[PDB]
Recover the amino acids of this structure.
């Protein structure tokens, strides 16, 4: 067993966390009580990656729930599958300010969360590491989530830290301090995670509005996309296949330089094998509001789920690379790897999930950089933060580090083999 | 000729011994510097995480001074 | 006596070991429980098959083998599989954390925690040998375990067993079935570290095996199991001389004398024929001349390269089945006239021939047709260096930008280990150029 410990934090973190556990429990045949009423056993062969086994054949997600507000905890327990989680793994406090989540309010509660992390970790035969779901635009998931990463990283410096980070969009939330909170979190993520899935609320909205034609898409509409993606990118962690994937092998093969670890996920359909491939590389199927043809792919992981000719998948993946060869860096040979799993996600006979490390991700960070400096060069709203003891230099530094990430992404987009 | 015969077999023994000796010393030196280097990298990683705790304490201190 | 101990390392090595030992059992009449009814030597004997199998008092024939992996997944399937009773549990060794496709973890971080145990188990096998000849080491170039742990083991074996013979079966990476983008790094690191510790190494190019399954067995998308059944046939041809008696049998070590002109030039090209489906072998018997001819068709090589644009330093033919020297000599004579076989000027041009009469076996439910006669050719050709050139180029594209190097440095490796390894490979490619130049 190679256990992952899952952590969800803040408003957004706990919502997408529950849906992920709903979707993969359904795919592995676990009901809200934790019992296995499953058809195939491929579901149980690697089930220990994400589930603790309990007496009476109960499966408890290795999941820890955290928030500085007690409300969203209650909805989780009331929500579908709320009884499957272990009740001790709920940690709750009693405000959309990163500083409060990271330095003052969140610090007050972080020691209590680590106690729960330790308990689940000490029962592990061989811990892979952690995956954190959170938004970067609020206060708890953003500020306290990144504090938790630092504290966990200090205690498990040889484990992999992976996050699913939800980037803010004005198209979804009007809270003005989102660009500050996002920039401060990114500053933490660049230094202290090994892999981050950029789950962009702008792209999720744009998919719902344009592709899915929803005039006013809800957080429920957005998260349906998120659950499909999270199911896809975890496929090779959860099922037996030609590759024994784990979080470390994902990092090693996707991250050519430590800081360039922010992935564009893609999903299709939002079909024929050529079409799945064609759509999956399409900008309209990306969960990060970036156009890949505005950059170059350092590495790509592709997962095909369902029943299909793997010969045809092989040819189509070779085909898309040959026809789009300019958008894959030539100094990393064979930088696209494909995996195939027989079980499709719920409701689909065939799906394709895409994980790209693309220099076009700089567009996402550029967008946040604009909203950030629009306020900071006015020194606007700093008092919410300097009032907590923060220094102007800290905002300049977090801004400067995220500026550096875009330059570095631009540096390797322009590099050539000869 | 007898003298030359045992010098040949002594030479064969000496080369085989020297090869064994250098392989043993080569990996002993390799594992030693590998262990140092990995530890230096982990030590630097903790030293910067600890600086994050020093900075977080200072942040709360400055908040108190603001009262 | 003259025992051989096999060591299977990492996923590729373990799974190929499964195919090989299954095939050996079928070839020798050994049941999955290890009983061999035709062996009247109960608990012992100095028979030819005893180089690869020891015997218990209870009549069980046990592979002289150790399986090592840094994670339990692949070896667990051996522990619960069809041939579980064949192996003593101590022969199957597993850690808990694999190398995560990282040579530095296989060689140092994870590998160093289990190396002493592995050498203890190997030592227990050696101590049961009255005449140990050497080791056969199976592994991938590309895996973190196959590369890093294997080279650590080869270093320790040179220390613990002097210059006792060490042979390799090495899986060269191919994009069609590879698992990691850093396989070129792991390949160059392990080739460099292992070069001095190996006497003879058989490279198996996964793309060549993948093509043969697609072209000649009509397999649309070959799996590891398809590749390994073919690979085990080649491994069986090479080891057949060690495992069977025969008047015309020629020992593998006698072919080695011819295959290895300088210590570093020790990578023979293997070519195997016939590989044919049951549907096509029907009412179609391949003669000695036809299967011999097929050994000079590049599409049948274990490593993609073009011997027609290189030079030969040796050429060996290993036949099994219904073959007599007269047919072989006739087939060679016509081939010499009709083919592009250029030898370097400093070595003789004759072909060394071995014949074992036991005909090839096929695993039930496989894809290979059962044939009356087969041949594996082993040639020392300068052409095999092309495979080094392709890998060194892939290594160079990534290393110039230092792509992924931080994963190795983070495990304690230094940049100088990469450049030292790449320089040795450059000097190897140059060695192969120099042996092909005419004398003065
Ligand atoms: N022919 C053949 N090749 C294999 C097989 N399994 C893996 N390989 C090759 O081995 C390479 C990767 O090395 P692996 O052996 O799988 O990795 P490992 O030895 O388990 O080491 P780790 O990375 O730590 O897991 C790939 O490029 C594959 O082509 C197999 O069963 N048959
Ligand atoms: N895509 C998406 N974004 C969300 C969701 N919930 C919150 N956000 C974003 O997160 C930011 C506010 O963070 P918040 O959820 O309030 O953090 P918390 O209250 O501390 O848990 C806003 O900019 C939102 O855009 C969600 O369900 N989906
Ligand atoms: C660029 O080359 C590679 C990219 C990724 C990987 N690994 C480890 C993967 N890990 C997971 Cl979890 N899923 C997938 C799906 C397709 S590949 C893959 C390996 C090589
Ligand atoms: Ca016997
Ligand atoms: Mg492995």
């Amino acid at each position: 067993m190679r256990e992952i410990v899952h952590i969800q934090a803040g408003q957004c973190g706990n919502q997408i966390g529950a849906k992920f556990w709903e979707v993969i429990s359904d795919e592995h045949g676990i009901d809200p009580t934790g019992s296995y009423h499953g058809d195939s056993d491929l579901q149980l062969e690697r089930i220990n990656v994400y589930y603790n086994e309990a007496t009476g054949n109960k499966y408890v997600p290795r999941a820890i729930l955290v928030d500085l507000e007690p409300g969203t905890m209650d909805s989780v327990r009331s929500g579908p599958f709320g009884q499957i989680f272990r009740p001790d793994n709920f940690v709750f406090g009693q405000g959309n300010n990163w500083a409060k989540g990271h330095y003052t309010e969140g610090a007050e509660l972080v020691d209590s969360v680590l106690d729960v992390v330790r308990k689940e970790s000490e029962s592990c035969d061989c811990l892979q590491g952690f995956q954190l779901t959170h938004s970067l635009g609020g206060g708890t998931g953003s500020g306290m989530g990144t504090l938790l990463i630092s504290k966990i990283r200090e205690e498990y410096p040889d484990r992999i830290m992976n996050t699913f980070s939800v980037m803010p969009s004005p198209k979804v939330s009007d809270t003005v301090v989102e660009p500050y909170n996002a920039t401060l979190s990114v500053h933490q993520l660049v230094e202290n995670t090994d892999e981050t899935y950029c789950i962009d609320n702008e792209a999720l909205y744009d998919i719902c509005f344009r592709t899915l034609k929803l005039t006013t898409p809800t957080y429920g509409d957005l998260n349906h996309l998120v659950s499909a993606t999270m199911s896809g990118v975890t496929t090779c962690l959860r099922f037996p296949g030609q590759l024994n994937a784990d979080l470390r092998k994902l990092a090693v093969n996707m991250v050519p330089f430590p800081r360039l670890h922010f992935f564009m996920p893609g999903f299709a359909p939002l079909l024929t094998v050529p079409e799945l491939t064609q759509q999956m590389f399409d900008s309209k199927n990306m969960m990060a509001a970036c156009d890949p043809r505005h950059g170059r792919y350092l590495t790509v992981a592709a997962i095909f789920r369902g029943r299909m000719s793997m010969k045809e998948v092989d040819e189509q993946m070779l085909n898309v690379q040959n026809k789009n060869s300019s958008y894959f860096v030539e100094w990393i040979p064979n930088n696209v790897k494909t995996a195939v799993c027989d079980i499709p996600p719920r409701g689909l006979k065939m799906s394709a999930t895409f994980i790209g490390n693309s220099t076009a991700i700089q567009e996402l960070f550029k967008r946040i950089s604009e909203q950030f400096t629009a306020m900071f060069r006015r020194k606007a709203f700093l008092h919410w933060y300097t009032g907590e003891g923060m220094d102007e230099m800290e905002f300049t530094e977090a801004e400067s580090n995220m500026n550096d990430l875009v330059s570095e992404y631009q540096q390797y987009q322009d590099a050539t083999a000869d | 000729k007898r003298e030359h015969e045992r010098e040949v077999i002594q030479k064969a023994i000496e080369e085989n011994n020297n090869f064994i000796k250098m392989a043993k010393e080569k990996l002993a030196q390799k594992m030693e510097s590998n262990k140092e280097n990995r530890e230096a990298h982990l030590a630097a990683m903790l030293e910067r995480l600890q600086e994050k705790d020093k900075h977080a304490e200072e942040v709360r201190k400055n908040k108190e001074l603001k009262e | 006596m003259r025992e051989c101990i096999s060591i299977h390392v990492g996923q590729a090595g373990v799974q190929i070991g499964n195919a090989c030992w299954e095939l050996y059992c079928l070839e020798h009449g050994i049941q999955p429980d290890g009983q061999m009814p035709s062996d009247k030597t109960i608990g012992g004997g100095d028979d030819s098959f005893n180089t690869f199998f020891s015997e218990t008092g209870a009549g069980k024939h046990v592979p002289r083998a150790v399986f090592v992996d840094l994670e339990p997944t692949v070896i667990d399937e051996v522990r619960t599989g069809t041939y579980r009773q064949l192996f003593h549990p101590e022969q199957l060794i597993t850690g808990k954390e694999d190398a995560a496709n990282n040579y530095a973890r296989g060689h140092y971080t994870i590998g160093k925690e289990i190396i002493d145990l592995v050498l203890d188990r190997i030592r227990k096998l050696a101590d049961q040998c009255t005449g140990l000849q050497g080791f056969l080491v199976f592994h991938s170039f590309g895996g973190g375990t196959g590369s890093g742990f294997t080279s650590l083991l080869m270093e320790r074996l040179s220390v613990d067993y002097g210059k006792k013979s060490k042979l390799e079966f090495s899986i060269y990476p191919a994009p069609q079935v590879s698992t990691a983008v850093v396989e070129p790094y792991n390949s160059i690191l392990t080739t460099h570290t292992t070069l001095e510790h190996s006497d003879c190494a058989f490279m198996v190019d996964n793309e060549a095996i993948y093509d043969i399954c697609r072209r000649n067995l009509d397999i649309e998308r070959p799996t590891y199991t398809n590749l390994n059944r073919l690979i085990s046939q080649i491994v069986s041809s090479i080891t057949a001389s060690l495992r069977f008696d025969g008047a015309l049998n020629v020992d593998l070590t006698e072919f080695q004398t011819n295959l290895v002109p300088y210590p570093r030039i020790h990578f023979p090209l293997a070519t195997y024929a016939p590989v044919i489906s049951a549907e096509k072998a029907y009412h179609e018997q391949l003669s000695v001349a036809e299967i011999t001819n097929a050994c000079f068709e590049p599409a049948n090589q274990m490593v993609k390269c073009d011997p027609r644009h290189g030079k030969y330093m040796a050429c060996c033919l290993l036949y099994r089945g219904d073959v007599v020297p007269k047919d072989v000599n006739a087939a060679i004579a016509t081939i010499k006239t009709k083919r592009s076989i250029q030898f370097v000027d400093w070595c003789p041009t004759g072909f060394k021939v071995g014949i074992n009469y036991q005909p090839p076996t096929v695993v039930p439910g496989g894809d290979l047709a059962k044939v009356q006669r087969a041949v594996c050719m082993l040639s020392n050709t300068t052409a095999i260096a092309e495979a080094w050139a392709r890998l060194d180029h892939k290594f160079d594209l990534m290393y110039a930008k230092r792509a992924f190097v931080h994963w190795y440095v983070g495990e304690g490796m230094e940049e100088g280990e990469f450049s030292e390894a790449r320089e040795d490979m450059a000097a190897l490619e140059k060695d192969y150029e120099e042996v092909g130049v005419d004398s003065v």
Summary: The domain at 1-256 of chain A is CATH 3.40.50.1440 (Rossmann fold). The CA atoms of residues 5 and 217 of chain A lie 31 Å apart. The longest strand of chain A covers residues 297-306. Chain A has 15 helices and twelve strands.
